Amino acid sequence: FVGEVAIVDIISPPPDIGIRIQCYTRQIDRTKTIRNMPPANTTFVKFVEWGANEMGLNFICDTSYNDQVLKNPGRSITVASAILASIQDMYMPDVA
Amino acid sequence: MNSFLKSILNTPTLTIRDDVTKLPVWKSLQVKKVEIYSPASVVSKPLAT
Secondary structure, X not given: OOOEEEEXXXXXXXXXXXXXXXXXXXHHHHOOEOOOOOOOEEEHHHHHHHHHHHHOOOOOOOOOOOOOEEEOOOOOOOEOOHHHXXXXXXXXXXXX | OOOOOOOOOOXXXXXXXXXXXXXXXXXXXXXXOOOOOOOOOOOOOOOOO
């Protein structure tokens, strides 16, 4: 697991003081924004590649939908976190 | 076994005193035993330094 701390608590009182922590993966993106304009007319794979470069992650894509043209795929994405929701939305549920 | 010759500093007499009145009470009793327990809790976790 790799993640960032989100929520803090205290569980057990003295003599033994124990704490609880909540971590989430890629939570840094919920603050970072988008500064590279997404492609207008393009195939699925290039949209995925742009998203991977924007977030900053090594990516692998292997789908039967690799040669389908999308129009205005991500022109309504506020921060970097909604990229994944965009990618999942189009070809649900076969594409995960 | 004469008794009533109680040594000082350790006179084995049970005195019960009301906390607001501060006057002895129930001096009609004849006690036979007394027990005192003083527990405490100690941590049981590995701890780090």
